[PDB]
Amino acid sequence: SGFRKMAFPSGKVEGCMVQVTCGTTTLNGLWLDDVVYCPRHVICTPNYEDLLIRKSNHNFLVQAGNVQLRVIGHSMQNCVLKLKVDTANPKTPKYKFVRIQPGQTFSVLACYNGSPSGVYQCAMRPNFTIKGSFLNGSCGSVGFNIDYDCVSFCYMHHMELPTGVHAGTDLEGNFYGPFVDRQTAQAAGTDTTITVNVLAWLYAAVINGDRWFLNRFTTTLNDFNLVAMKYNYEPLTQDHVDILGPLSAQTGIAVLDMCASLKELLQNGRTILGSALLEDEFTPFDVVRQCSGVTF
Amino acid sequence: SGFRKMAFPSGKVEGCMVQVTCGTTTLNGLWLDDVVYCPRHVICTSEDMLNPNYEDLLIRKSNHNFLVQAGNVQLRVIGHSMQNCVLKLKVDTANPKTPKYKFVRIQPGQTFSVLACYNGSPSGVYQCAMRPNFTIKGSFLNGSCGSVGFNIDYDCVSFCYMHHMELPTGVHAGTDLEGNFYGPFVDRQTAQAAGTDTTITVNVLAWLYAAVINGDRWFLNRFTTTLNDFNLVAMKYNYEPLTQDHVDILGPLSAQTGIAVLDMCASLKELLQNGMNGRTILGSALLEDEFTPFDVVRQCSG
Ligand SMILES: *C(=N)[C@@H]1C[C@@]2(CN1C(=O)[C@H](CC(C)C)N(C)C(=O)c1cc3c(F)cc(F)c(F)c3[nH]1)C(=O)Nc1ccccc12
Ligand SMILES: *C(=N)[C@@H]1C[C@@]2(CN1C(=O)[C@H](CC(C)C)N(C)C(=O)c1cc3c(F)cc(F)c(F)c3[nH]1)C(=O)Nc1ccccc12
């Protein structure tokens, strides 16, 4: 029993982290095969096309611990810098690049100077920001999930907003949300609660012996959606009902019955899983992987 | 900026996890050098779990009775010895992935990362704290015994915990890497009760300093208190006593924010009497006690 904010085992990702230095700027790089992916803002003192044409291969100092890697080429893809290196990473795992949807979670391996400092779970907020923990030097730190034995890289850290939340790109350099890689005052849209994730966390509470919030009532998907609007909650789709199915069968509580419990919880407000708020940073798959004991 | 429940990168520990099987029992083992450390209850029979005689069961075991697997590589056991509640299995090959490591025994209130494993393979990593009643609030299912707790300063892995059992309340109990249980727990399937748990006061105060560092000031007040008056309050709320030693360790955080410890104590006293009134501190609607003053410094400074 027990329910914690559990990250993925970061072992496969640590073997990919390298230090990238350009001028007086030092950040992190993701070494996969013979390419090092890192935020392009490492070339700033901005016109990225201009600054990149004025760079040579040896202008980029890449370090894998104490081993200096020789840059044999460089190219830009959106907001990511791709540095071709002479040696392929022997610790390159089975990996792929994915772009996650708002509401999806991932583990962040925070790094400084190419070395991993810590690991934590994060959710891609519906306003396309992450509520992470990043200090100066953590750009290039990545977000990932693990399915079977494949690392799915979904996030690269680029910036912090004046509000304290963070923003970054997928591994193709495409920013999540309306953010740009300029050191300018940027504002995130009004954030909303990930409804399907709160429902999955309520199923995790039933699995761990918390039933006080349950009620006899059931609802329709349309009535529950009218309620979600009045509370800044993301709409619940029929697709979300299908992904909640396995958790609904394991507890014997229909999704629309748990929706009537969530409606009641939102109108009145005890603790659930040691929290005094409705937690939205656990997907239905996060609940299954923790409560079923999925390994990697 | 930002404040999260941050675990240590588990890479160095994943390379040490092996699967240990004894009879019909399968659990996790920690492979360091040519020794595999695991909970000794792996030698218990499904029938006699209440009062096993470990010295008696270990004398009737041979090296070939222990099946150790490192992924797909079966390791040959060349010897076996018992140290308190841990079983140490001498193996023929030294772990090539053995990191720089040491064994430490933590004090209640201290935090650490838990690499949860099943069948020798890592499932997940979370942050934990040694509760004042000597239990941990882990997330563990059957087959998780042998999973370890660790801290990684510089490049050395401090192994401080090995998972052994779950108590009827859903909390967990285990040993240090010398096999000494934390608390009054024994490795038997006998009726065991953890004492009434209490809140780690110094950790809540450190987390309040982390909130000021991250721009949360709503809970602050002009009042100050004495250490003795605050301690009378802590009792009325099931909080552990705040000692002068705790004031000293909180010093660096107090100097970085300019808020005296006894002033933050008057804010905690106020927070305990009213609550949150709908407000949140660092995204939590409760007073968090699982961050030591050193965890706050690690995360906020680097
Ligand atoms: C990456 N190495 C660091 C880590 C940091 C963001 N970051 C950057 O390099 C950012 C690059 C820009 C996208 C060009 N960066 C400097 C910012 O995001 C940034 C700078 C400021 C301010 F000066 C003021 C401000 F109000 C603001 F919102 C800013 N954002 C990160 O994740 N956290 C952090 C803290 C301190 C310095 C750097 C970074
Ligand atoms: C380790 N492989 C598993 C994981 C589990 C505890 N655990 C054990 O093997 C424990 C060994 C004892 C110390 C001999 N174990 C069986 C328990 O701690 C245990 C068994 C029971 C009960 F039958 C009833 C009960 F009320 C109780 F509190 C028990 N504790 C773990 O951490 N969580 C878990 C869940 C289910 C099975 C095993 C384990």
Curated annotation (Swiss-Prot), chain A:
User: Residues on the Cytoplasmic side?
Assistant: 1-296
Which superkingdom is the protein from?
Viruses
Active site (catalytic residues): H41, C139
**Ranges where the Peptidase C30 domain occurs:** 1-296
Instruction: Describe how its activity is regulated.
Output: Inhibited by pyridone-containing alpha-ketoamides compounds 13a and 13b. In turn, alpha-ketoamide 13b (tert-butyl (1-((S)-1-(((S)-4-(benzylamino)-3,4-dioxo-1-((S)-2-oxopyrrolidin-3-yl)butan-2-yl)amino)-3-cyclopropyl-1-oxopropan-2-yl)-2-oxo-1,2-dihydropyridin-3-yl)carbamate) inhibits SARS-CoV-2 replication in human lung cells. Inhibited ex vivo by michael acceptor inhibitor N3. Inhibited ex vivo by compound 11a and 11b.
Which locations, inside or outside the cell, does it occupy?
Host cytoplasm; Host Golgi apparatus; Host nucleus
Signal sequence residues: none
Catalytic activity field? TSAVLQ-|-SGFRK-NH2 and SGVTFQ-|-GKFKK the two peptides corresponding to the two self-cleavage sites of the SARS 3C-like proteinase are the two most reactive peptide substrates. The enzyme exhibits a strong preference for substrates containing Gln at P1 position and Leu at P2 position
The name this protein carries in UniProt is: 3C-like proteinase nsp5
- Supply the gene name: rep
